[PDB]
Every structure is written in structure tokens, then in C-alpha cells.
Amino acid sequence: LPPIYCPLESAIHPRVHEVEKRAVEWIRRSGMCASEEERAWVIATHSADFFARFAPTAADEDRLLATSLWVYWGFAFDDTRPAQFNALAGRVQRALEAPSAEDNGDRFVPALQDIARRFRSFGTPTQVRRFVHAHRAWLSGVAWQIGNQARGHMPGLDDYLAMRLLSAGGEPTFAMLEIATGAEVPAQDLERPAVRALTEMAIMVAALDNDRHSLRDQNIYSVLMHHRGMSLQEAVEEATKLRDRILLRFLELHDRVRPGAGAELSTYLQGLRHGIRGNAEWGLRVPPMEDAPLTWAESPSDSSPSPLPGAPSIAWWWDDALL
Amino acid sequence: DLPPIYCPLESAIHPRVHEVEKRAVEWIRRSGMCASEEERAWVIATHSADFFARFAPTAADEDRLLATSLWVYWGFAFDDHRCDNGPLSTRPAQFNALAGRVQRALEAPSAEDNGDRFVPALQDIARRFRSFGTPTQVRRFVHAHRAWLSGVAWQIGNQARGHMPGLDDYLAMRLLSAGGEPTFAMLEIATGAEVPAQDLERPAVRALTEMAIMVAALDNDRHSLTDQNIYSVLMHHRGMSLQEAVEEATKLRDRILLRFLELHDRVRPGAGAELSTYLQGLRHGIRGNAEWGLRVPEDAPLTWAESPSDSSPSPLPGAPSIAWWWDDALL
């Protein structure tokens, strides 16, 4: 219902149409897709359009292609019992780390291994490891979510935000910014608690915007309705206040970190901001992407600068002493 | 009929092992980690300070060796009560949530235990790592720790199904579930030695780390002898006797150790100071793992093999997912 607060820069790679056409060929040829139907469903994610918003000035079209390919892959892979999923997640992650691993007729492994090959031809081994760790974090997230669903466990707010941080694919998505842009962010700059908090907050805002984008299971609305006793409308309102509050804290902490930041950390931070907006805008415009004018909230629904009560796993985002 | 371990590597133990052991035993009593005197005594009997004092035997700061040894105690305890025998040990759906909560607590100091006695203990370990290590070094441990839990989740998935993995899946799984990734990721935190990312993430050094982890995991399978281990894996997939399996396992573990040694000798000369200390750690830990395994209930002369049981310098047959360790062009 309520329009999205997102006062962040919107931009899209000028070569997005050229990257999309190469991506559509890669998808047709990959083996990822059994039937013509499934090729069309993956194409209809408009994943080039999504990631071209994340890295809108990427110098090398081929690096933007490679990173865009993983987004298609993630959507195809996400479209299994916990016991078999823990093994699949293990085998798929091994294939990302081990170029010698063999497919064993799993349709998703050669495809992932083709993306990994392209990442290893552009990226420093350091940037590839950052992606690998991000990819395992996402898989852990998915495993947690598949486990909760199989058991009929509706998690509380704390567990739900912890899990969604990972299961919504934001860690591997933001971990591709560097691979798309080129220059390596120094470990000292990327692993700073303040920058880790910016990354997780960008991820969390993108995940809650994706919860919103699918209202029409385990999402913020069911979690709040089950564990607080809310109507749907009361939960939509609470979810928005909560998300808007994480985003204010992101803007606050970004304005403290940005001034001192080196070239590469500065680029990465512009990426978080582009990605938050890009994800929101992509989710508004996706069914030929819709191009009718969009309305954006001028103001946050909740302007508190305090931690979310009921979500202690994210409270540390507000603890400047810790950062 | 189980043959001696081939391990021609430096055996060394920290001169202050007994002082660190004593502080570790005090911490284990205060930790709330152990439900009963019986479980305190079981954790103490892992001699985890003896174990990790062999991995960083010249660690300048005893507080760094202590913090590091604590996680080894914690891991043994967590694994015994939550991974290997807990109602979670065949309940993958529940383990996935626990893995998520425990891993979040390691990453987020603000996180709350929600009744899990393992969580406050790990958070104190993490607090020590954050006080000593760079945020980069702590991120390496955190990533390693998640890798380990992913492997345990795969193993518990297998158990629930009664699925006995083949060699390839078993090696890949056990690379993670034996806890070698977080164990070796604490080397740097014990020595103080921040290893530049360009040096640690080199494919060649990643291969050396994985091989050290793989040899120590196969040595643990040997120390611990339906159960998922290399002997059941070969018995099930190759229709071997236990005796033929024991000999097959020794062959393929020795052949991995020989590749570790060949690659180490090509990597070591070029290495800077911090990577050099890290590689000495891989070697000390392989040996430390094997010797701690043979001595843990102590001082009687050990016998080691003089020769590897197999010395093919080619990838292990039936294990494609590790064949890249022998690819010098990738490495």
C-alpha cells in the first residue's frame, strides 16, 4: 500500500540493453533451463536491468554481464526437503570454490561454474573469495528458511531479520559490486564494522522492499501478524516504520563514513546506495520494464534514531562505540 | 590392523601450554557452556589447549593462545551436544535454524542467547578475538566458522536420510564438517601475524589450507576407529572389507599429504614473513592434529611410517572436487 521512502540516486548502466541481449543468449545455451517455458520465466526476471542499476558505470560490459548472469542463476536456482537441500547447498557451493568439481547431471552446477570461470578471469582471488563467502551465507539463509517451512516454525522478528539478511540474496549481490566496477576494495576498508553495518543495512532494506514487492509465507507481514496479533494493514504499517528506520540509520552512518573513505570504498558505498534504490525501483517497474512515473515517499514513516526493539541481532548497527 | 601415520613434519608445543590449559579450565567452569560436572570434565578431557598449543607453538601473547584454545574447547562441546548426538543430529530442519542463530551471535555482539548455553560462551570467545585481531582476521574466522556449520548441516542431512555419500561428496563435506577451516583460520589470531589478503587468498595457499584440513580430517577418521567416515564410505561404495578400506584410506590420505608437501616447497621460498608463519602453522597443525590424536587419553614413544603408502603425484581417483589441488596452472 504505502509508497517507498528512498531518497537515493537512481541510475542504470547505459549499455543495459546490450548486456541483457548477451545474457538472454547465455540463458538459452546454459542447460540451467529444461523447457522453453522456464527460459522465458528466467528472462522475465529482467536481471540485467536489476544489476545495471547496481553498477551503472561499470567500465567493462563483460564484468557487468558476468555479475548479471549470477542474478539470473539465483532466481532460476531459487525456483527440496531440508535434508537433501543441505547436501545440494554443499555440492553447489563446492562447485563455486572447486573448478574441477563435476556436475553429476545437476543442471545448476555447470552454469554456476561458467559464472565462477568469468569471475576468476576478471576478479582478484580476494574479490572471488568475498563472493564465495557471501554465496555460502545466502545458502545458509535459504537452508534456515526451508527448515522453518518444513517444520511449520514461524520465526519471531529477531530470527526473521537474521535469516532474511541471508536468504534474500543481498550478501552475494553486493559482493559483486567490486567484480563489476574493477578496483579491489582494501580488506581494511571493506571489513570495518561501520562498513559491514552499512552493507547489512543496505541488504536488510532491500530484503524488506522485496517482502513488500510480493504481498500481492515467511515475510515480515506474517511474522508480525503471528507474533504481535496485528491485522494485515497494521503489519504493513509496522513493517514500513521498521524498514524506514533501518534506512535512516543507513543514511546517518553513511554520512559519517563517506567523507574519510578512499577511492574504492567510496565507489562500493555508491554501489550500496545505487542497489537499495535500484532494487526498490526494479521491483516497482517489473512485470519490457514499465516506465510510467513512480511516486516516492518524501519522508520516513518513523524517524526514531533508536535500535528496533525486538531485534537485538541488528541493535549493534546503532552502537557507534562498537563501530 | 591399522598402520602407522606418515607425518614427516615439525612437532612442537607452546612452552606455556600448562599455564594456558589452567586458564582454559577456569573459563570452562565459568562459561555456563557445561550443564553438569560430568560435561565440564568431558570438555576438559579433550585437552584442547594441548591441541592448539601445537598449531601456534611460538605465539608471543598467551591471551591470544588462550582465546583461540577456548574455541577448540567450545567446538568439541558444541559438536558433542548439538551436531553429533543432539536430537538435532538427525533433524536437519532444526539444525539449520540453530546454525543460523549461533553464526549470527558470532557476527553480532548485540545478539541474545534465547536460552542456548553455547551462545554466551561463543560471544565471549568473539569478544576476545575482536580485542586482539583486526576486523579482517575476525571476518576470516567468521567465514570459516560458517563453512564448518554448512558441512555439519550436510552431514546431518545425510544421517537423517541414511545416505552414505560417495568419496567425492564425503571429501567435500568432511573438508567442512571436521572443523578444520575455523581451526586453521585462528593461526593468525594466535600469532598476531596479519597475513595480507593477496597472500592468504592466492589459489596455491587456499589449496595448501584445504589439503592441511583434508589430512587432519582423515587423521581424525583414523583416530575415531552407518557412521559417515572414510572407512564406511569405501566399504559402501567399493564393497571393501574394513581391512581393505583401512589400506585404501591410508593410501589416499598419504597421496594428499605428498601433494601438500610438493606445493608447500614451491610456495615457501617466495613467501613474505606473515604467509611464512601461516604455512609453518599449516605444517605444525597437520602434525599437531595427528600427535594429539595418538596421545589424548600421553608420553610413551610413538611410531610413525617412514614412507608414504602411495606416492602417485596425480589427483585422487573418484574425487574430482579436489583434483584442482594438482593443477599448477590454476595455482
Numbering used by the authors:
A (entry chain B): 10 to 88, 98 to 234, 243 to 313, 324 to 359
B (entry chain A): 9 to 233, 242 to 313, 326 to 359
What does the paper say about this structure?
Spiroviolene synthase (SvS) from Streptomyces violens was first described by Rabe et al. and represents a bacterial class I diterpene cyclase that we were not able to produce in sufficient quantities for crystallization due to protein instability. Terpene cyclases such as SvS form a variety of complex multicyclic compounds with potent biological activities via carbocationic, electrophilic cyclization cascades of relatively simple substrates, either by metal-ion assisted release of an allylic pyrophosphate (class I mechanism) or by protonation of an oxirane/ene-functionality (class II mechanism). We previously reported a hypothetical ancestor of SvS—SvS-A2 26—which shares 77% sequence identity with the extant enzyme.
In particular, we noticed a surface patch of five consecutive ancestral mutations (205DREMH209) in the turn directly preceding helix H. This patch is located 17.9 Å away from the carbonyl atom of the effector residue (Ala186), so that it unlikely impacts the activity of SvS-A2. Exchanging these six residues on the surface back to the corresponding wild-type residues (205–209:DREMH/AQDLE and Ala89His) resulted in a surface variant of SvS-A2 with similar stability, despite an overall reduced expression yield. Therefore, we anticipated that the surface variant may constitute a more suitable structural template for homology modeling of SvS-WT, especially with respect to adequately capturing substrate binding. Using the surface variant as a template (monomeric with modeled loops, metal cluster and GGPP) resulted in a homology model (SvS-WT-Hom2) with overall higher sequence identity as well as optimal average scores for dihedral angles (Z-score of +0.541). Specifically, the local Z-score slightly improved for the catalytic DDxx(x)D and NSE motifs (arrows), even though the local Z-score for the RY-dimer decreased. Overall, we considered the homology model derived from the SvS-A2 surface variant (SvS-WT-Hom2) more suitable for mechanistic analysis of the extant enzyme. Redesigning the surface of the ancestral enzyme to restore wild-type sequence at selected positions provided a crystal structure representing an optimized template and improved the confidence in the derived homology model of the extant enzyme, in particular for regions involved in substrate and cofactor binding.
